[PDB]
């Protein structure tokens, strides 16, 4: 069983980075950390999307990974997609030093994210609190700036 | 036992690029592998699944051929082969390999699952273990990694 995974994020613009995933126990939380650069200062939606398909760029990754067919939420919510990792924050130099721990994604089993796509978005994820239909689907986080397939790591 | 389709976008430092599809209708049946890879020199090119889906150093960080049974390198029809030994693909005079392979050793689920690992197309022919040196029973002498991608779950 995989205990480590990695994702190289690339897109059409300047946004790029490397995100690592580590999971001590298949029961336990996944630590997610790494650095993304080229971003506008502030919050960006950060999600695992369902398909590891980059054939038409980030668009072919499909919607948020949601095998329990829930509504969109933030990572602390009981009602959330498996792929709802919330936001990451870029500093004034355009750098997000990502550091998240999450107990809903996994590197094995039904919630396994290996082979799916990590995407960093154009705008803040509103965490399902925007009071419109789109908030309960995508969090209003806008365009996909960069993405990559999550792969098994050594 | 749940993924029935996968996809891989191959890219590299040169002109080689392609899209490869994988389909496995039954979890205990074969995987069909097909697609098109352009920018290749005419002739045979090694075509392998490497162990790690790690592209942080481009194709180099993918590590060696995926080989969970710790066998020696072979061709896909050999009993003695790596799980990742898919043989060669052939590029035509226009630089295009129209890949079409069916393999019963790789899978899209369980322990031979290649989801999340890296598909690489190589510079030269894979000699299928028959080259009479130790590099032959490790990599098939297929030489450098021209393009690669992580194999992802597809719709
Ligand atoms: O939930 C978990 C929390 C922690 C772990 C540890 O094994 C992994 N520790 C992470 C780590 C390791 C090295 C780092 C270097 C620079 C910046 C951040 C870094 C985070 C597993 C988990 O599954
Ligand atoms: Zn969501
Ligand atoms: Zn091999």
CA within 13 Å, CB half, A142: 9
Q: Is A111 a catalytic residue?
A: no
Sheet holding A84-90, edge to edge: A84-90, A42-49, A117-121, A144-149
Look at A52 and B152 and tell me if their CB atoms are within 8 Å. Answer: yes
Check residue B94 and report its DSSP letter.
Answer: T
Q: How many domains does chain A have?
A: 1
Min Cα separation A131/chain B (Å) = 30
**Ligand 1 lined by A105 (C-beta under 6 Å):** no
Beta bridge partners of A18: A8, A35
Task: List, in order, residues 6 or more apart from A30 with CB less than 8 Å away.
Answer: A21, A22, A23, A101, A102, A103, A105, A106, A107
Q: Which atom of ligand 1 is nearest to the CA of A24?
A: 23
Q: Specify whether A81 is catalytic.
A: yes
Look at B56 and A115 and tell me if their CB atoms are within 8 Å: no
**Ligand 2 centroid to residue B38 C-alpha, Å:** 36
Instruction: Please name the residues in contact with A79: beta carbons below 8 A apart, sequence gap of 6 or more.
Output: A70, A71, A73, A128
Query: What is the span of the domain harbouring residue A29?
Result: 1-154
Is A121 within any annotated ligand binding site? yes
Cβ neighbours, 10 Å, residue A17: 23
Tell me how far apart the alpha carbons of residues A28 and A105 are, in angstroms, rounded to a whole number: 10
Hey, which residues of B are catalytic here? 48, 50, 65, 73, 82, 85, 122, 145
Q: What was the structure determination method?
A: X-ray
Residues in A touching B148 (Cβ below 8 Å): none
């Amino acid at each position: 069983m995989a205990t480590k995974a990695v994702c190289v994020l690339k897109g059409d613009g300047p946004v790029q980075g490397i995100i690592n995933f580590e999971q001590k126990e298949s029961n336990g939380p996944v630590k997610v950390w790494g650095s993304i650069k080229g971003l506008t200062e502030g919050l960006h939606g950060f999600h695992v999307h369902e398909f590891g398909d980059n054939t038409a760029g980030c668009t072919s990754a499909g919607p948020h990974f949601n095998p329990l067919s829930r509504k969109h939420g933030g990572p602390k919510d009981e009602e959330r997609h498996v792929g709802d990792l919330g936001n990451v924050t870029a500093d004034k130099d355009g750098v997000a030093d990502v550091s998240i721990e999450d107990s809903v994604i996994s590197l094995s089993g039904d919630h396994c994210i290996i082979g799916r796509t990590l995407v960093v978005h154009e705008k803040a994820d509103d965490l399902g609190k925007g009071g419109n239909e789109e908030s309960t689907k995508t969090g209003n986080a806008g365009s996909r700036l960069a993405c990559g397939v999550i792969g098994i790591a050594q």
